[PDB]
Structure formats: structure tokens, C-alpha cells
Amino acid sequence: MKVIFLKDVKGKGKKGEIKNVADGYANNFLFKQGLAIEATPANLKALEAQKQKEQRQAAEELANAKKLKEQLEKLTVTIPAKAGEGRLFGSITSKQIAESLQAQHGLKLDKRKIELADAIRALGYTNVPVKLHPEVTATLKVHVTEQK
Amino acid sequence: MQKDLHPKAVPCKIIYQGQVVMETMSTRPEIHVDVWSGVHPFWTGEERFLDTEGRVDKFNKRFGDSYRRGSKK
RNA sequence: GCGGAUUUAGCUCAGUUGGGAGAGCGCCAGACUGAAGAUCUGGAGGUCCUGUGUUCGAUCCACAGAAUUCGCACCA
RNA sequence: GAGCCGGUAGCGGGCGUGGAUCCCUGGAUGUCCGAAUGGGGGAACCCGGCCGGCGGGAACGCCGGUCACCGCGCUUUUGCGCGGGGGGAACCUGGGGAACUGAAACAUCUCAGUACCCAGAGGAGAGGAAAGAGAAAUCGACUCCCUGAGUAGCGGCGAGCGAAAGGGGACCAGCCUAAACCGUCCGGCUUGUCCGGGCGGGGUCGUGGGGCCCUCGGACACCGAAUCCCCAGCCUAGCCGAA
RNA sequence: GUGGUUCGUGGAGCCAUGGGGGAAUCUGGGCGGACCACCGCCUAAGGCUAAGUACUCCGGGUGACCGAUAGCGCACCAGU
RNA sequence: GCGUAGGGAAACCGAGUCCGAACAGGGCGCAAAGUCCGCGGCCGUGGACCCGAAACCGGGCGAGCUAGCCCUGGCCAGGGUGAAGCUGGGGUGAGACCCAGUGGAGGCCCGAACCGGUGGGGGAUGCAAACCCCUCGGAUGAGCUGGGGCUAGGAGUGAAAAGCUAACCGAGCCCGGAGAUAGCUGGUUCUCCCCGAAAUGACUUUAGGGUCAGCCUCAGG
RNA sequence: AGCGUAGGGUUAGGCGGGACCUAAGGUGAAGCCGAAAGGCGUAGCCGAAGGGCAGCCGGUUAAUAUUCCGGCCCUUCCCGC
RNA sequence: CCUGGUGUUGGCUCUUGGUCGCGGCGCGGCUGGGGGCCUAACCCUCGGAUGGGGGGACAGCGCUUGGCGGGCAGUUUGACUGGGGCG
RNA sequence: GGGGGCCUGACUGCGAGGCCUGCAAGCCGAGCAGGGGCGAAAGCCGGGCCUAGUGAACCGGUGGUCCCGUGUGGAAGGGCC
After folding, report:
1. Range of A128's domain?
2. Residue A85 and residue A139 share a domain
3. Are A113 and A131 in contact (CB under 8 A)?
């Protein structure tokens, strides 16, 4: 039985799970129900079409987390707020993160990323291992300052 | 004609007849019966060109049913 | 005659560790009885189907027959 | 080419060479039944919508025409426009399909796939370019006649049944489409690359088809029809016609 | 498990199929009579195809074919 | 296609061959050679010397026959017998229960039409393919009935003998297999010449058939 | 002559059948099953001295008659108001 | 008519048997028996609609197995024989 | 016909030539060859003193052949013993 999965087999895993459900058995109860279909070359193309589409959405987004990547890990990270002789009066959040570099420096980037223990403040040079792409990120430099 | 398949015919003929073997494995065979009977499949419900339901049997049924060569479900 | 089932005491049968030949009977005897029976004691019971072979040793393992029995095979 | 109102010869009356009777072919009527079909029904009868004159409607209102069964395609829209079915002596294939009787019984066998019934095609259907035949590396459509052959062979090896290739002959004759490969699109899913159906490519005769790259190459090859008059044959009477 | 075939169960194939499994797209896939090697043939599982043979209701032709109890039974107000 | 060799299961050999390992026999060699045709006595397939039955099998045909069953009407002149009941009276508590009145059932009795058809009479080329005469049973009922229909002929129906199913159903009737087979039965034609039969023996699901012999006849040596 | 030839005879708004109704049963669009022919079969329809429906008495010919005469009794449809 | 395997006759779990391999037990593939609501076929059900309900892997029903089986169908059941038979 | 000695011809290949005979059967048999046994040897032996102890042909089993083998190599299968 060329059972073209669409969910379960234990659950739902509609992920390349063809299983000899068996004759009318798997035939009637599984898909009559509506939960995938049979070989049908069309599909046996359907699955691969879209496993290939998925294949573009990963390596691509791989090429999207590799362009900002290098371009990003080279230049600076300047954000001179106010302060006294250390620390700022309103710490420094990766929130104030995005906002700047973006608008200013330019390219849009998240604010859930960047690996921040808390709201620094120590102004000036203090790098921040910023989690960009799932496997590859950006431990960039950050030089703040109380422009005074 | 209302006892066939739609997706092909298979009904009729059937020249049965039993005997009492006992050959090649020694000596020779014999004869008897002289009857004639039927022999076929079964039918399920479907539909085509505005309702119709269909019928035809297994085999075939497993087919077109899955697909449909003149009307689906 | 094609196949299966077996072969031990007078009868009916156990017997698998390859080394004791066993049980029941039933049978015989003793005890008991007025005797016999019933009970208790005891005893015997032998071609382990035959032959040959294997083995230190064969009821047991191996090799034909045979016989009994059941089913089947039947167009000379 | 000059007689006629049929077989009726009879009474009573009449058409005709300013081409009658009749011979032809194409017509217009074709009452009622019968597949019947508008509806019903014991056939040859009795019943209904639309149009219809308007008709005696003497100062009072009708037949005629018509029309429409149902299964088939499908311009689907509210479905408008095409085909069918009933026959038919004999013959044709399919669907189904038997005892007698022979075997000097009779269960195998035979009569047979006959007789019959059913459906349906035709004027002929049957069949028909081969996963064929056989073995000389030989043959080639199908069919039918002779022959092969009462042979090879089937079998209570009994009664019987009993092929075919090859050779001779009649005839000849070849073609298509799914056949997703290409492009065209139309409709969906839901945008891609899925299935879908109309257009061509090809649409295979005896192994090919596409798609790519260079040689191409640049008019006689008609089928089962399609067509024109042609001799259109016949279609009944055509008419002379030696003494 | 039946068919047809000369094949009546047979050493018994090809083609056709009643039920059940359910391959391949040219070194593919049946075939040449159990099977197997090698050789040889063919390319299926859609379709159309006049002509060559059959048959007489019809019309004609012809008869070592008939004559009214023969011929079709029925030669003429007969399938009555 | 028969003859031109054949011999053999065959391989195959071949005027020789198969058995075999032996020159012992079987088949044949030895040409004598046919072949086609015509005309005949016959033999097989044929319906096949000619008609003859009871039956089997196919497709139709019928409940205006009759047996049923469904639907729907009609019909039983008179009379007789007298149960449930209800009314009243009756010794006990009520009653059982008795009696008397009324009352009117019952596949009930006596009998017409109507349904039938034992028991005798006639009739026997009848009046008739079941009828006439005298006689008899049933006589509000598994009652008789008209009209409408349903079933069906290897199947129906059947208060059931194998009855009835269009006047003889032990499995209807017509057309078809078909001119079934038919050791039995008959039937089996113009003259004349010639000779002249058997009625036994052997084997038969064979004995009143028929194979082979024995006895006939014609052609040649 | 209930035999031959010839001529002639039977008339209905109200009698009967239909122009109304259904049970059996038969048909039968749909629906259901057959190798084919076919089987069944809803609703609707067919189906009768069962249901329903508006008259009777006398006269009058060679024959008819509740129809023809006449005297008496009615019903349904339509148009008008 | 009864009957094994097979089919459109789908899920979930409870289990014992064989087997060969690595009296035994541990495992292992193999495969056999079987007990369960379910349940999406199937069928039936209906009860006022197409949904519910009940049964449910049944069974109907198809294919092969085997069995009963005079209910029916077709044949048969010799000869002799100083009559047919019995003998 | 009664014992004892070794011995098995209680043979294969065949049989000239007859008995009985419609059929098929049935039955006999010198002698020829290969190969033995018994006897010195001349010879006898192809079961019995005989005449009953029986069966067609096909339907098959099996030990031998290496005859056929359905395109050739073979085998299923078949023919012959």
C-alpha cells in the first residue's frame, strides 16, 4: 500500500512517511477520512516539490544570515547616550539595540536575538554575542558612551 | 445488463465437474459431473454525472474507485 | 501390498542416565477360618520379538524381517 | 397511337388524334388500427391544453388545423437541435444452449455447439497488417475454393471424432489514435512545475516517436469514402423491322 | 477452476478468461508446445478497413422438371 | 494421389531385411506392372428397401374444462324442536340451585326450489360420448351461486384415489429435434432360362438375433 | 319457415356504458434485482349489475319504444342582471 | 444445507503453542491458537429527514474445500428355464 | 516306482514338422548354435508319469534398453525387453 502519509502513523508526522497501511484497510479508513493520499505520480512529485521548496527556504535564509553576517561582524557598534563616569543613567537595552543601528546604521534586525544577560550600562567597548541565525550569529562589537 | 462491473465484464460461463483422479501417480483417471454455474465479484457505492452510485465489483473496483475513468466520487 | 502406530512375567502394562529387569493382577503360599472369602505376609513371574552390529557394558542406539493394528492407496 | 369508363359480358350515360385508354418516373392527397408515442384502452374505439375559421350561430356559437410519448447527443443557460427503436422467407455473428440415437446396455462419448430461444449488425455481416506461422535463417493481412488428409492425432484407444503450416487458385491493400516528450491553452489546486480537456507535434505497418546540434531539402504519391459530367446499367412502355 | 483447439485431465502448450496475488518501457517483454541453456521469430494489454466466399423475398434465363390424387399443399371470388 | 522395392516399434538398412549373435525361421525379392474412366453385383456413412408404436428433449399454446385461492353481488317457499339469557316466584346468610314465564341459538330436525347424483328400472349404431324413470342424502351452512380475476400444466392444484387440469393428464396440447431408434410386425412389384439350399457346430447381458465354419452360385486355372 | 330473392324496420339532457371513484388484480415515470428476453413495483391511471347519478303513464305502425306522439315531473352547464 | 482458507472483512489491547538459531530458561525471526468495546466496509435499523440507533468484520455475499444429500435427474437390476419366478 | 552321489537346462537364440481347429488358443517335437551338468564313456537334461492347478487387449508399477525425444543440447514423456 503506497500510503502517502499526511499526519500520524503514531501521530501527525506528515513528513515523508509512506507506510504500507495495506489494501482497503489503509485505503478507506485513512484517506476516505482525509489524511494524505496514494502514490499518484502527481504527488510523489507533490512531496518532492515541496521538499525542494523547503530546500530553498533554508539554504536561502542561510544566504540571508550570511550576508548581514560578514558585513555586520566587521564594522562598529556606536551608541553614545548620557552618563557620569561608568555608568549610564538609563542602562542600555538590546531594545535601544534595534531602534538605532537599524534606523541609523541601516538594516532591520530583531531584538529577541542578541545574547544579553541584562541591561549593560558600562558604556563604551563591551562586545555582545548577538544570536543572528539559528546556527550562525554575530558576536559584534559595541562601543557606547555618554556623549556627555 | 445489471449484474456486471461497469469498469469491465466478468460474469458468466462456468463448466465445472468433479471426478476421481488417481493418475500419473499411478494408473488412470475417470469422469462424471456435467453441470454449469456462475462465478464473479461484488459491488460498492459511488457516483457519477449527477448521482448514480455505480456498482461494479472488487478488482476493477479497487481501480477506477481509487481513480475514476468515466466518473469519480 | 502405501503410510503411521507398537514388540518386556501366565494376563494387562510401566520402564529416559546405556550399568538394578520392574509394577499391578493376577497367580502360588503363610498367617487367620469350622472351611473357603475378605484383610495382612511373602514368593515366583523372563527368548525385554529374532539376528547381526555399535559400546567397557544394550530392554534402550543402528541395520532387515516379521506380526498386530488403523487409515489409503485400486481401470490389468 | 387512335380507342375507352378496370375482372362484368347487362341496363342508363358519356371522353377522346387545337397528342384519350394505358406503359414510366417524380408528385399532392393518404380516413381508423398497428413500434404508436398526447392521454386511455377488451387494436382498428373513446378521452384532454394552443391556434384556428370565427362558423347555422335565419332573432343564435363548431369542426378543422394542431399539438405535445420515451430512452440518445449535448451551446450546459430555461437545455434548444440531431439519431433510435418496429419489421423481414433464407443467410450472418455474438449471448445462452438439449435429450433422443449411435457406442447393438449405459454413467465417459456421439448426435453439436446441432435443433431451439435471445440480442443485434448488414446487404452481406464473419473476420482483417501478426506478442502470426514454422524451421529450408523459409514464409508473411484476413477470407474463400481445391489440396494437404480421412493423414499428424484425440479416446471406457471402443463407437466415432478428426487439425494445420506448406503448394495450386479467386482477391489484393492500406491506415490510425491514449499513445504526456514538445509546445497551445482552458479549468481547477490554490501560483508554479498537479491532475484536467479541446489544438497541433508525433499521431509507430514489419521498431520507433520526441527533444538538441550540423547535412536537409527547394512539384505528379490520389481512398473505404469526397467530387464532376463520362459509357451514368437498369428503371415500363422505346421501334423499325427480308420474302 | 472451466473454454476453444485434433488434445476427453493427460509428459500437455499457445490464445481466451471465473477468483487471488498484482512486473518490466528496447540488453524491455511473449513466443517456437513440461522445463533449461543457446539460437531463431515477434513486438501485444485501443480502433477503421471496400474486393475474393453465403443466402434467395424479389426480376430474368434455362430444363434427358412436372401435368391436374404429379408439381408449392394452394393454375385462380384458398392458407379461404 | 494411387502403382515405381520392401522389411522394421524405431534408429535405419535396403532387392535385402528384422530376432539374435546366428548362417535355423517370419516378412518379402523373384517385375507379369498398373492406372484412369465407363457401365454393374456389393460394402461404409448416410432418413436410405417403405410405412409402424409406447417415449425423451425445446419453444410456445390454455381456469369461458375443472381444482383452488383473492375481490364483489345475489340466493335458501313453508314448518318443527325449544339451550345462554332476561322477568317473576321458590326453604338458607347471600347463594348454590330448583320451577314457571318469556325467549329464540344450532354446520339441529321434517320437508320445495336449489345442491346430489348411493339403491333398483330403462337406454347400449341411445334423446345423449352420462342422459330419462322410479328412489335417496344435504336442506343458515367447512351452504348453493352469478359477475369480475390469480395461479398452469415435471409444474399447478388437490378435506388427496394419483384425483382434475378444455370430454382417455401415472406427468397436458400444438409446432420443432425428426422421416428419433424400432433383433419385432407387416408390406415387398413384368416374363423366362439354369442349378440347386439349411432348420447343425463353435463364442456371445447371446439365445425367435448374429460372427466364423458347414451345405449354394457364377469367373478363371 | 326461425329456407330463397327484394324492400323496409330499431331515434333518448333525464334507461343502460363512458364523458366520476377505487379493493383484488393489471399496468405502471421514479426505485429495486436478471447472461439477454426479463422480475418486481410507489404514486398516478386501467378495473364492475360494488359506489355514485337528473322522470312517469297512456297513445301511436308491418316491425321500434322509459327514446315517436302528447299530457304531467325534473337536472347540469353558460351569459345577463 | 454444514464446512476449512480467500476477498471489498478496518483499529486497539489481553494471550498461549510451534519452530529453527543464538527436560532449559533468557532472547531472537519466524508463525500458529485465541479474548475483548470499539469501527470508519458491510448489513440491518428506525422511530416522524440524509442523523441518530443496533449488529460489525458478522456476515450476507465471490472464489476454491470438504460433507452430508432419492429432495430431485439420468442409467442399470444377465442366460439358461422341456411356461416366468423360487429352486 | 524305493535310496545315495554330485548337479539345476525348473536354459537363452530357435525350431524341420505335426496333432485338435470356424477364432484365437491349446498341444508335440528331432535337430542347429552359445553355455553348462551327469557319466570313463554310447547318451539323457530345455522341471515333474500324464490329461485339470485357468484368461484376451487394452488401463497402469517396477529392474533392464540407451530405439523416439515434437528449434538443436537434454529431461517430462514414449516406443522395445
Report:
1. 60-148
2. yes
3. yes
Residue type, B34: D
Please list the alpha-helical segments (H only) found in chain A: 23-26, 41-64, 67-72, 94-102
Cell triple for A70: 560578514
Residue B73 CA to residue B61 CA, distance in Å, equals: 12
Q: What resolution, expressed in A, was reported for this entry? A: 5.9
Do A48 and A65 fall within a single domain? no
Chain B segment 1-60 residues within 8 A of A by beta carbon are: none
Cα separation, A76 vs B12, in Å, equals: 89
CB pairs under 8 A between A and B: 3
Experimentally, how was this structure solved? X-ray
Asked whether the beta carbons of A44 and A109 are under 8 A apart, the reply is no
3-state secondary structure (DSSP) of residue A44: helix
A20 touches strand H (CB under 7 A): no
Chain A residues with CB-CB distance to B62 below 8 A: 24
| Residue A39 and residue A52 share a domain | yes
CATH for A140: 3.10.430.100
In 3D space, the residue among B73, B66, B61 whose CA is nearest the CA of residue B7 turns out to be: B61
Number of domains into which chain A is organized: 2
Residue of chain B whose Cα is closest to the Cα of A25: B62
